[PDB]
C-alpha cells in the first residue's frame, strides 16, 4: 500500500518545504514588523509544543526500552554487543571529524573575506564565559553517569560552576558543584542497562517487571504514533518561526557560505557515502533503501534540531517499517542518541579549523590529532548537557589554545548547521543498529 | 446503621463549628497578644499537616485513577463522555458567571459606602504586578498541558515571567519561560488519560499495568480513609487559625457585606437550585439526598480552601456512599477538579462587577459577555497555578481595561469567599459525575 | 569457604589502611603543593563516585524494602514490632548520651589547654548563623514527615528560614518555609510503611504490587553487590583525600586529644560493651561473632561518614551472611538509619559538655537531663537534614543557653569523630534488627 505507507513522508517533506516558504514570505512581506513578539510566540508555539510532547516521552521510552532490551539477551552477548556498538560509534565519529578536517583544509572557508571581521559578532562578550576546564567537563560527565539521585536525574544534571573562594592570596577560581536543569539521560541510560542486566541475572522474580516495562514502552509507542501524526504541523511552524526570527535573504549565507557548505557537504558525505558503504560492506543490503525507510525522523531532526526528541519517532519507524529486531533497536538506538554525535564532532572540528584558518594558524599533524580526539570525546561531552549546542568548542580551544575571540560568529548560524548534525546523528544510530542486528543474526 | 454512618458528617460539622468558636474566643480573649507567632504556627500546624497529607496523595490518586478509568471503556465512549463532560462543565461555569452578573447588578454591592476608600488597601502596591498577558496565560496553559517532563510536572508548572531584554530602544517587557513551583495537575491529567487510552488500544500487554494502577489507587484510597478520620481536627485548627490571623468581629463584614452576601448567595443558588435542578431533570433522582451524601468533602473544602486537596475524600465518599460507578467517578472527578471552577468564575465575575459598580462604569452587554467568556476560560486558567487564588482577576481587567487600582481590597477577604467557591466546585464535579453515570447507564 | 568469604572484609580493611598510608605519605611529601586543586578533585573523585552510587539506590531500596517488609506481617504484629523498635532505639540513644556525659565529666577534656583559645577558629563567624528555634526544628521534622509531595520528597526537604517581615516596629525574625535540597528519607519511610500496611489491608489486589516491589528491591540488591565490589577503591581514595585536605601530623590531635579520645572511647564502649551485652542478654547468641559478620558496612561507614549511604551494603550483608530474617531486616534497618543515631547523640552531648567544661559551667542535674533529652530528640532531628552534620548543637545550646562562641572548633575535626558515629549508628541498627528477629521468632 504505497499511497498510505508514504503519506507521512510526503507530509513531513511538504511540511518542511511549506514552512520554509511561509517563513520566507512572512519575512519578505514585513516579518516581525507585521507580526509582533506576541504573534511570533503564537507562531512558534506549535514547534515548542511538539518539542514538549517529544521530550515528555523520551524518559519513559529510553528507560523502559533499555530495561526491556538489556534483559532479552544474556550478559555475555550484551557485553559483546555493547562493545562493538561503542567501537562503531567511536569509529564513525572519528571518521566524521577527519572528514571535517579534510574538507575545511581543502575548501579553506577561513580565507580573507567578510568573515574576517568579528567586532560586531563578539563585541568583547566572547571572552567572558564560564571557561569550563576539560578535566572538570570529564568529571561532570562521569558524575552525570552514576547519578546521585534517579528522580533528580530525570530533569537535572551536574554542572561544575566556578567560584572565587581563594581570598587568602592569588585569587584562583575553584570548582563547586550545583545541579542545574537538563535531563541526565546518560545516567538514566546506564542505570537502566544495569537494571536490565540485574533482572536477567534474576529469573522468575524478574518476569513480572520485564512484562511491566515492555507494556509501558508499548503504551509510550502508541502515544508516539499520534505525536508522529501531529509532527508535520509542528515542524512547519517551527521552521517558519526559526527563519522569521532572523533574516535569511542571503546575508549570513553570503558571509559564511564556504563554512556552511563545508559542514553540509561533510554531513551528506558522511550520511550518503561512508555509513552506507559500511552498511553495504557488512550486511550486504540496500543502504539507501533503508535510508528512505527513515525519512520522517530525519526530517523531524532537521526541523527540531534535537536528537533526543526525534528518537521516539525513529524507534517507532525503525521497528515498524524496516526489518530491525525489536530488542536490538531498544538497546542500541537510545545509546546512539546520547553517545554518537557524528555531525556534532564534524562541525565542531570544522568550526575549529575555520577559526584557525583565519589568522593563519599552522595545525600540522599533532594539533589535528588533538582536535580529532577531543571532538570524539566531546561527542558524548556535549550529550549530557542540552544547553551546550556549540558551547563545547570553547573548552576544545582552551585545551589547544586558539583564538576564542570570535566564537560568537557561529551562534548566528548555529540554528542551521546544527540541524543537519541531528539528521546525521540519528542516521548513524540507525545504521549501527542495522549492522549489529545483522551481526547478531549471523 | 445511621449512628455509625453519620458519625463522620457530625464530626466534621462539629469541627467547623468548634473551630469557629475557638478562634472567635481566642481573638476576643486577646488572640495574638496572648498567643505569639510561635504558638500561632503550632495552632495552625494541624491544618498545614492535613493539607500536606491531602496534597501527598492527589498525584497517585489522580494519575492512577485516570489510567484505571480511561482504560475501562472503549475510546469512542470515552470521547463522547469527555465531550459531554466538558460541555457540562462549560455550561455550569457559564451559568455561574451569569448568576454572578445578575446578582451583583441587582444588589449593587458597589454602592457608595466605606468600600469606596482604597488608599489603605492599595497604597500604590496594587498597580505593581507581573501583569501577565491573556495570550501568555493561554500559552502557559497549553504548555502546562503537554508538559516537557513528567517528573518536573509532578511538582512544577510553567510560568512566563517578563524581562526587559529590549535595551536597543523603547524598552518593552519580553516573555521568558522559567518553571516555578506548583503541581502541573492538568498536564498529568492529560498524560494519564492519553496513557489509559493507549493501554486500551493494547490488549493483553496492558492488563498487568492496569492491574498495577488499580491496585495502587486502591492502596491510596485506603490511606484516604485514615486521612479522613484525621481530617476534623485539621479542619478545626485550620479554621480557628484563619479567623485568629485576622479579626472578624464584623469590621470587614461591615465593610463588604453586600459583596460577600452576593458571592455566598450566588454559590448557594448555584449549588442548591441550578445544579440540583439539572440533576433532577436528567437522572430523576433526589439531588438533595445526594448532596447530603457528600457533606464531609464539602466541609473539608470549606475548611481547606483547596479543591484538589479535598478530592481524595470526595472520590472515596462518592464511590462508597452514593451509588456512582467506580470508573465514571475515576474519570470525571479529577477532571472536574482541574477544569470546573463554578465558584471561581462566579466570584471573579462578581468581583469585576463590584469594582466596576464603584466608579460607575457602564458594562452594558458586550463587556458583560466579555467578562462571562474570560471568566469561563479562567476557570481552567487559574486551575494549573495554585498561587493564583484571585490573581487572575488582574489579567481579566487588563483584557477589558477597568480600574485595577483597588484589587487589593479582596485579598483581605479572599480567605472567606474562596472557601464557598471550593464547596461549589467539588459539588459541581460530583453532580456532573452523577449525571454522566446515569447517561452511560441509559 | 573462608578464603572467598573473607576477601571483602580483608579488602576494605586494606583499603582503609592503605588510604591512610597514601594520604599521610602524600601530605608529608608535599601534599597540595605537589598536587594542586585539580588533582585533588581527581584524587577525591572515586570517593564522590562511591557516594553518588550509594545515594542513587537508597531511595529504591528504602521505599521498596519497607513496602515489601511492612506487608509481610499483619498490622498488629507490625505495630508491636515498630513500638519495641522505637523503644530500643530511644533507650540506646539515651544510654549513649549518658555515657558521653559520664566520660566527658570524668576525663575533663575542657581543662585549661591550647583548646582554650578560639579566636582563630571562630573569628566572629560562629555567632552569625540561622539560629533555628527548637520549635521550628520540630515543626520542620513533622513537616518532612507527611511530605507535601512525594516526588519532591525524593530530593527535597522542608527548611524554615527566617525573614525580617516585621518592619512595623521592633524587628523580629519571622519564619518562612522554602523547600531546600536533601532527601526527605523520613517522609518516604513513613509513606512507604503506611503504603505497605494499606496493601496488607487489601488482599488479592495487592499481591501484584508486593511482587513488583520485592522484585525491584532484589534488582537493587543485585546492583548493591557490584557497588560493594567497587567500594574499597572509593574508600581508599576518599580517606586519602580527607586526610590530604587537612594536615594530620598531630597538631589538631595535640589540640583536642582528650575530646577525640572521649568520643572514640564512648563509641567503642557503646559498640563493644553496651549493645553486645544487650544482644547476649536477650537473644543469647555471640554478639561479637555477629559484629564480625558486618565489618564491611562498618568500614564503609568509617570511610563515607554517611549512615544512609552505607545502608544498602549493610542490608545486603545482614540478609546474606548473618541469619537475620529478610522481612525484619527490611522493616527495621532503614528505620534504624533515619532515627537511631547513637553516635550522633553521643558526640553531640560530649561536645556540649566539653564547651561547658571550658569556662567552668555548672551542669549539675537538670541541665544534664536537658542535654540528654534534646540529644535524644536531635538524633532524629539531624536525620532529615544531611547538611547538619554537627549544626544541631547550636539549637541545643540555644535551648539551654551556653557559649556558642567557639562552636567552630569542632568543624575542623568534624570529619573524624563523625565517622565513628556512623559506624556506631549502623551497628545499633543491626543489633536492634537481630534482637527483634529473635523476639519475633520466639
Ligand atoms: O547535546 C545535544 O546535541 C547537540 C549537538 N547536535 C545538536 C542535536 O542534534 O541535538 C545539539 C542536544 C541534544 C538534545 C537537545 C534537546 C533540545 C530540545 C529538547 C530536548 C532536547 C539539545 C541539545
Ligand atoms: O486554582 C485554584 O483554585 C482557586 C479558586 N478556588 C479556590 C479553590 O477552591 O481551590 C482556589 C487552587 C486549587 C488548589 C490549591 C491548593 C491549595 C493547598 C494545597 C494544594 C492545592 C490552590 C489554589
Ligand atoms: O544526618 C546525618 O547524620 C549525621 C550524624 N552522623 C553522621 C552520619 O553518620 O551520617 C552525619 C547524615 C546522614 C547522611 C548523610 C549523607 C552524606 C552523603 C551522602 C548521602 C547522605 C549526611 C548526614
Residue numbers in the entry:
A (entry chain B), B (entry chain A), C (entry chain C): 47 to 488
Publication text:
We determined the structure of hASCT2, reconstituted into lipid nanodiscs and in the presence of the inhibitor Lc-BPE, at 3.4 Å resolution using single-particle cryo-EM. The protein adopts a single symmetrical state with all three protomers in the same outward-facing conformation, in which Lc-BPE precludes HP2 from closing. On closer inspection, Lc-BPE overlaps with the region that HP2 occupies in the substrate-bound occluded and substrate-free states. In addition, we observed a strong unassigned density in the binding site, which overlaps with the density of glutamine in the previous substrate-bound hASCT2 structures. Building Lc-BPE along both of these cryo-EM densities resulted in two binding modes, with the ligand occupying either an “up” or a “down” orientation. Here, Lc-BPE is located in a space between HP1 and TM2, thereby occupying an uncharacterized subpocket in the substrate binding site, which we refer to as pocket C. Additional rounds of cryo-EM model refinement were guided by a closer inspection of the cryo-EM density as well as by a detailed comparison of the initial fitted cryo-EM model with the ligand docked homology model and other available SLC1 structures. In general, ligand-up Lc-BPE is coordinated by binding site residues S353 and D464, while ligand-down Lc-BPE is coordinated by S353, D464, and N471. There were no compounds that scored better in the ligand-up structure that occupied a ligand-up pose.
The glutamine transporter ASCT2 is an emerging therapeutic target for various cancer types. Multiple structures of human SLC1 members and their prokaryotic homologs, combined with biophysical data, have demonstrated that these transporters operate using an elevator transport mechanism.
